[PDB]
């Protein structure tokens, strides 16, 4: 029912920024925090940050602090995750999570399918 | 409504051992994880042991770790602390906590273990 | 930083065979370790959270336990389907994760 | 482990005066993730088990009166109460939730004259 779709696949050169888009549907989108966790190819998972969409607060890992920007459009219940200075480690596959429930976010159920970024 | 009792203090000699029960009561005892918190002659806190709501985790004080064994029985909405080797330190107030995240937000009245010649 | 050490970094079974997976946090902080389940494709899937209540849909062959910083994921009966790889879980931390391959 | 350091240690007052009581972690209990202090607060009446009253080092517990306030972030934090009355004659201890093992303060002795009703 909770659905979580992301935007098509990104190209990009070395300095670059990338905006990738999460449209959720299935549910309230003011009441559950949406997370962003990147993969890159044949590695781990690697969390970003989140963004509470019913206050606009976010928070990043210090890993992306100045470089990653979280928004949100309560209009069209979608998030999007901008990330600037892209360079070839940045080349990952990136995903939009939400929790299982408001009470413990981390336990991401839901997945986007994932937006693959290419870089360089 | 909401409610904890705990039973098994007892005097017991140094070196003995004890199993000790919590009765829960007026909540889902399943869903939440509990926690034993002894409290000394001398009025100081120290936390004892931890379980989830499935007994599939469970954490200890590495000075307690080889000696105490929490468990939990769902069906009969019950909380236990198996203690061994019991020394003069483990001379307390064994109180029976509730956990919601990780702060303990209903004690019980608690059973007294005293240890001594 | 919690350093979640996911052993061993692949493995490859048999079906009907057992999986023991581990993963020891450099820290001990009040959590709830999560696994995850991601198929070769796929995003990842809600396998295991607070360390051995299963997710939704998640049968009874995973299991889940642990003591302290030490976490262990058993795969009972091993099916092809099991082919995947397996992330353990502590608020931002995830380990590097178990490549299971299945014949 | 972490050590909790409670101060006072105790204090004498009368009924409406203000009490500050403090509590410091040997190290900063905020976890960047969440932005969440683990810091709690339980109020001990005589003859009673303790009770919690606030967590997260600033959220009262239900039917915890606005005269007990929380603060702080990191390692420093703080529990006021405005204006004491007869009944939260107590023992107040801090609690750290965050690392294993859980750790409590000595607690702060609170007396009031005319007693605890």
């Known amino acids: 029912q909770v659905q979580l779709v992301q935007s098509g696949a990104e190209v990009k050169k070395p300095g670059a920024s990338v905006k990738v888009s999460c449209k959720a549907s299935g549910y309230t989108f003011t009441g559950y925090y949406m997370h962003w966790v990147r993969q890159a190819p044949g590695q781990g998972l690697e969390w970003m940050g989140w963004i509470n969409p019913n206050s606009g607060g976010t928070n990043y890992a210090q890993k992306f602090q100045g470089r990653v920007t979280m928004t949100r459009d309560t209009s069209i219940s979608t998030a999007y995750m901008e990330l600037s200075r892209l360079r070839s480690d940045d080349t990952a596959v990136y995903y939009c999570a939400r929790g299982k429930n408001s009470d413990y976010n981390w336990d991401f159920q839901h997945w986007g399918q994932g937006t693959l970024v290419t870089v360089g | 409504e909401v409610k904890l009792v705990e039973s098994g203090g007892d005097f017991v000699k140094p070196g003995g051992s004890l199993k000790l029960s919590c009765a829960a009561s007026?909540?889902?005892?399943?869903?939440?994880?509990m926690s034993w918190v002894r409290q000394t002659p001398e009025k100081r806190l120290e936390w004892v042991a931890t379980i989830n709501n499935n007994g599939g985790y469970t954490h200890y004080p590495d000075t307690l770790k080889d000696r105490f064994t929490i468990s939990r029985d769902n069906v009969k909405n019950t909380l236990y602390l198996q203690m061994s080797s019991l020394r003069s330190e483990d001379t307390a107030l064994y109180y029976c906590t509730r956990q919601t995240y990780w702060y303990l937000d209903v004690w019980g009245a608690g059973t007294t273990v005293t240890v001594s010649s | 930083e919690i350093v979640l050490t996911q052993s061993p970094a692949t493995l490859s079974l048999s079906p009907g065979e057992r999986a023991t997976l581990s993963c020891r946090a450099s820290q001990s902080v009040s959590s709830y370790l999560a696994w995850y389940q991601q198929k070769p494709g796929q995003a990842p899937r809600l396998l295991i959270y607070d360390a051995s209540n299963r997710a939704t849909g998640i049968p009874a062959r995973f299991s889940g336990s642990g003591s302290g910083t030490d976490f262990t994921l058993t795969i009972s009966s091993l099916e092809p389907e099991d082919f995947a790889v397996y992330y353990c879980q502590q608020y931002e931390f995830f380990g590097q994760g178990t490549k299971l391959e299945i014949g | 482990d972490v050590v909790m350091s409670q101060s006072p240690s105790s204090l004498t007052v009368s009924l409406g005066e203000k009490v500050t009581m403090t509590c410091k972690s040997s190290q900063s209990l905020l976890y960047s993730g969440n932005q969440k202090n683990y810091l709690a607060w339980y109020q001990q009446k005589p003859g009673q088990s303790p009770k919690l009253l606030i967590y997260?080092?600033?959220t009262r517990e239900s039917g915890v009166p606005d005269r007990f306030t929380g603060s702080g972030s990191g390692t420093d934090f703080t529990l006021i109460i405005s204006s004491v009355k007869a009944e939260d004659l107590a023992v107040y201890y801090c609690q750290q939730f965050y690392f294993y093992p859980w750790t409590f303060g000595g607690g702060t002795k609170l007396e009031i004259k005319g007693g605890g009703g």
């Open positions: 997260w080092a600033s």
């Open positions: 007026g909540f889902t005892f399943s869903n939440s994880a």
